[PDB]
């Protein structure tokens, strides 16, 4: 029968969905610049703290003098009690802890969609691009305190926020965050302890709760996804972008996580025949199978995760039910677009899935299927 084809609608890098979703080089460079600012300040803060520790190694300074020294560094941007705590922790170090600290130089690695190239331009007002730049503290396997490390990273991020109008700090359970509302951007800074020189010894720092650390190596997800792209093909990054774009269009705030969409989509494309020469059909195939993937619970590609990426249906409350509803509707949307009574209606319908981003109906062509 006659059908509308959406392959260019999806893939066209001029003004198709890929063209609308991929960051411009100016945006990508802006994110790399922001990343560099954070990394340099974090390096500096640790050097400033280490300078104080060096002074105390040389002579057992009074608490008051150590406090004075702290107040001249970037740590002056923490609260008074936090400054006290930093000075107290430096004061309380024994020779071994201090020697270990003097040998610590933070390292950095970006995780998430900036790293494996699936970061979309944000859609709705309020939505922001994220760059996830982790800070890594090489230490003996378990020697340098959870409290001090978090205070120093917080000092770095808070000192930058104090110097830049329109920057805000947010403490999250798994990271420090700088939000730049006007740039529709935030940078997330998770902190890890790793061995000094094996994913079992990569420990993510948690801010509050019964645990200070949890073993969660972001490299596991990065390698899993990069390997999946190689295995499945160049269309995997594209259809993950498209599913994330659908999520951004259906929910202002909320919806399924990006990682849950990636995991379910990889599962489907590993197991169901599809055709990269028609990403319209491929998206319909993915859409038909996502509800079953999500209803049974979406497993993490990291087997050590304590919970699935999305819960099985007997655990659903209103939010998961809403996500299932939208997932169920998606293949119907795509099917209806395919059989629309005109090109303009085909576009209107498929944009009910991905939002009114693509406006060029010449990317939709009359086909047979
Ligand atoms: N093991 C594990 N890692 C996670 C989980 N959620 C997030 N992460 C890690 O955090 C990184 C960034 O996660 P997100 O910001 O949610 O996802 P993203 O792929 O960057 O997608 P967008 O920011 O929406 O573009 C992932 O690549 C993982 O390394 C999780 O549930 N389990
Ligand atoms: N290694 C690792 N990193 C994670 C994991 N989960 C989240 N992250 C990182 O930490 C950042 C913050 O995660 P979250 O606090 O869960 O984001 P959120 O709770 O949705 O914050 P809001 O957008 O304000 O609702 C993410 O962008 C990831 O980069 C994880 O399980 N493992
Ligand atoms: Mg991210
Ligand atoms: Mg994020």
Please summarize what this structure is.
With 369 residues, this protein is α+β, with helices and mostly antiparallel strands. The protein is 51% helix and 14% strand. Strands 2, 3, 4, 5, 6, 7, 8 and 9 form an 8-stranded mixed sheet that branches. Strands 1-10 form a two-stranded antiparallel ribbon.
Describe this structure in words.
By secondary structure, the protein is an alpha+beta fold. It folds into two domains: 1-22 and 217-369, no CATH class; 23-216, no CATH class. It has 13 helices and ten strands. The strands form two sheets. Strands 2, 3, 4, 5, 6, 7, 8 and 9 form an eight-stranded mixed sheet that branches. Strands 1-10 form a two-stranded antiparallel sheet. α3 packs across α7 (146-163) and α8 (218-232) runs parallel beside α10. The protein is elongated, with a radius of gyration of 24 Å. Monomer. Interacts with Cap2 in the presence and absence of phage T2. A Cap2 dimer is bound on either side by a DncV monomer. Belongs to the CD-NTase family. A01 subfamily. GTP binds at residues 111-116, 244, 258, 305. This is Cyclic GMP-AMP synthase.
Instruction: Name the beta content range.
Output: 5-15%
Number of helices: 13
- The beta-strand count equals 10
* Secondary-structure class: alpha+beta
Helix content: 40-55%
Count of the separate structural domains? 2
Q: What is the ordering of alpha helices and beta strands?
A: EHHHHHHEEHEEEEEEHHHHHHE
Q: N-to-C terminal Cα separation, in Å?
A: 6 Å
Please outline the major beta sheet.
8 strands, mixed
* Coarse shape: elongated
* Ligands and ions found: guanosine-5'-triphosphate, magnesium ion
Radius of gyration: 24 Å
Region (Disordered): 296-315
Binding site for ATP: 177, 216
Subunit structure: Monomer. Interacts with Cap2 in the presence and absence of phage T2. A Cap2 dimer is bound on either side by a DncV monomer.
Keywords: Antiviral defense, ATP-binding, GTP-binding, Isopeptide bond, Magnesium, Metal-binding, Nucleotide metabolism, Nucleotide-binding, Nucleotidyltransferase, Transferase, Virulence
């Amino acid at each position: 029968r006659m059908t509308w084809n959406f392959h260019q609608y999806y893939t066209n890098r001029n003004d198709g969905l890929m063209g609308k979703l991929v960051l411009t080089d100016e945006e990508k460079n802006n994110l790399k610049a922001l990343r560099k600012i954070i990394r340099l300040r974090t390096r500096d803060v640790f050097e400033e703290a280490k300078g104080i520790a060096k002074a105390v190694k040389k002579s057992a300074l009074t608490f008051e003098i150590i406090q004075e020294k702290v107040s001249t560094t970037q740590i002056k941007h923490l609260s008074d009690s936090e400054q006290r705590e930093v000075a107290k922790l430096i004061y309380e170090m024994d020779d071994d802890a201090r020697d270990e600290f003097l040998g610590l130089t933070p390292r950095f690695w970006t995780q998430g969609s900036f790293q494996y190239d699936t970061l979309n331009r944000p859609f709705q007002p309020g939505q922001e691009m994220d760059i996830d730049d982790g800070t890594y503290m090489p230490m003996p396997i378990f020697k340098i305190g959870h409290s001090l490390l978090i205070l120093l990273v917080d000092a770095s991020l808070k000192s930058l926020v104090a110097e830049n109008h329109g920057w805000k700090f947010e403490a999250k359970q798994t990271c420090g965050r700088i939000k730049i509302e006007a740039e529709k951007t935030h940078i997330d800074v998770p902190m890890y302890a790793i061995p000094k020189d094996g994913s079992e010894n990569v420990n993510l720092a948690l801010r509050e709760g019964d645990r200070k650390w949890i073993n969660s190596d972001p490299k596991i997800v990065e390698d899993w996804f990069n390997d999946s792209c190689i295995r499945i093909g160049k269309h995997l990054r594209k259809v993950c972008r498209f599913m994330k774009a659908w999520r951004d269009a259906q929910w202002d705030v909320g919806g399924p996580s990006s990682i849950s969409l990636m995991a379910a989509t990889v599962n489907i494309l590993d197991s169901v025949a599809h055709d990269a020469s028609d990403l319209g059909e491929t998206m319909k195939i993915i859409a038909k199978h996502l509800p079953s993937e999500f209803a049974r619970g979406v497993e993490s590609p990291d087997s050590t995760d304590e919970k699935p990426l999305f819960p099985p249906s007997y655990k659903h409350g209103p939010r998961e039910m809403d996500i299932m509803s939208k997932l169920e509707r998606l293949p119907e949307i795509l099917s209806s677009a395919e059989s629309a009574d005109s090109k303009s209606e085909a576009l209107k319908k498929i944009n009910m899935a991905f939002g009114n981003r693509v406006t060029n109906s010449e990317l939709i062509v009359l086909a047979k299927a």
